[PDB]
Design a protein around this ligand. Structure first.
Ligand SMILES: [Fe+3]
Ligand SMILES: [Mg+2]
Ligand SMILES: [Mg+2]
Ligand SMILES: [Mg+2]
Lengths: 212, 197
């Protein structure tokens, strides 16, 4: 999904709000901040109501201005609440009644997702690959900066995982794939307008094709 | 008009989500309290610092950490949520590694700790992939042009830690002494370990 969450490469932001080894304070800066991840784990591991991938996608589905003005942990309160409503566990009415006011949610998905691709290639370290030039309106773990770009395989994982574009929609056809550390030259991704060297993206096999 | 939507205070929303689920019997006794303690007290960059100090003083462990990071971390018992498939990436005299999750905040939680606000910021997520040398410079870390910067974007299930170079002036230090100079920011890659004057 080509949402505002796909931030890598966006220009116009200021300084990162940190200098090295500065005090970051406690893990949680407010008494509620442990709730979004704890209740996410209740949903995934105790209730079996959704996957972690569905949590990433529901946050991507926040209305774009809402995403941009919401602090990180609050986005996950909103996302987990949204999934509880969508899965039929909670109602928005009871959330708003308990909260004492408005509790707007992420927007409905506009894609049913897609299955793990049937035709893929096992790549080896050192091979040249291109990121498939494809547009996916639902969840995908491919940042747009690498779509269509060529890089080299530095690692093939020794484990396999469900394809995000299916499991992030709760589909039954996510299969399993390994992922690949694909190293891109900085100039492949941003031409002359970069000061870096290389970028390594960890890409599911189903996002890749042989280069040429 | 681009205005924000009306919202109840976030604390009220987050506790409403808790109470809605808890009141239905869906949240075990002590469950969110248990996770809070794990997040605060167990998931910690002191673990990644222990791994770095071991690698610096034990060439066999260094090789294992760099070839099978999951197995190396498992010897210490530090595998966990958001830290099951671990890859450690080695800095060298010509290479500086830096980690980000441009799409969200993905981090090797058990051995780096939960990510800090700055790492989750839109500024870091947008900028470090494109201009890591300037971002590090602004953060207080100068990386010379003779060094390639390599940014790892945590887009799948690999969870990374940086193995920084060991600084001069630490020859013969104990693992405990070495651990102290390996900070969270050294494990993420935006800092280089510092030795006191
Ligand atoms: Fe993330
Ligand atoms: Mg975009
Ligand atoms: Mg209403
Ligand atoms: Mg055919």
């Amino acid at each position: 999904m080509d949402g505002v969450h796909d931030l890598a490469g966006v220009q116009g932001f200021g300084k990162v709000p940190h200098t090295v080894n500065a005090d970051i304070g406690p893990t949680f800066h407010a008494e509620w901040e442990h709730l979004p991840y704890s209740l996410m784990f209740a949903g995934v591991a105790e209730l079996g109501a959704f996957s972690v991938d569905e949590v990433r996608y529901v946050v991507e589905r926040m209305e774009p201005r809402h995403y941009m003005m919401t602090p990180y942990y609050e986005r996950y309160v909103i996302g987990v609440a949204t999934l509880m409503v969508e899965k039929g566990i909670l109602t928005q009415d009871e959330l708003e009644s308990l909260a004492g006011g408005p509790f707007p949610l992420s927007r409905p998905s506009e894609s049913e997702g897609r299955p793990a691709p049937v035709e893929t290639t096992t790549f080896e370290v050192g091979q040249r690959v291109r990121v498939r030039d494809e547009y996916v309106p639902g969840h995908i773990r491919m940042p747009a900066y690498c779509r269509g770009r060529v890089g080299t395989i530095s690692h093939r994982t020794t484990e396999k995982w469900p394809f995000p574009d299916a499991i992030g929609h709760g589909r039954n056809d996510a299969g399993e794939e390994p992922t690949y550390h694909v190293k891109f030259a900085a100039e492949e991704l941003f031409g002359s307008d970069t000061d870096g060297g290389s970028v390594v993206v960890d890409l599911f096999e189903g996002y890749l094709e042989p280069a040429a | 008009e681009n205005a924000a939507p009306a919202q109840a205070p976030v604390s009220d929303r987050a506790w409403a989500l808790f109470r809605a689920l808890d009141g239905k019997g869906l949240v075990p006794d002590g469950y969110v309290e248990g996770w809070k303690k794990t997040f605060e007290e167990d998931f910690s960059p002191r673990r990644g610092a222990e791994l770095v100090a071991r690698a610096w003083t034990d060439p066999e462990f260094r090789q294992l950490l760099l070839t099978d990071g999951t197995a190396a971390v498992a010897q210490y018992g530090y595998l966990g949520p958001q830290g099951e498939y671990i890859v450690a990436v080695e800095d060298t005299p010509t290479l500086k590694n830096v980690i980000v999750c441009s799409l969200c905040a993905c981090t090797a939680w058990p051995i780096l700790g939960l990510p800090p606000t700055w790492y989750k910021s839109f500024e870091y997520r947008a900028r470090v992939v494109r201009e890591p040398r300037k971002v590090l410079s602004e953060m207080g870390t100068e990386i010379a042009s003779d060094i390639e910067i390599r940014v790892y974007d945590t887009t799948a299930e690999t969870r990374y830690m940086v193995l920084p170079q060991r600084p001069a002036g630490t020859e013969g230090w104990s693992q405990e002494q070495l651990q102290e100079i390996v900070t969270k920011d050294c494990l993420i890659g935006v800092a280089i370990p510092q030795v006191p004057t």
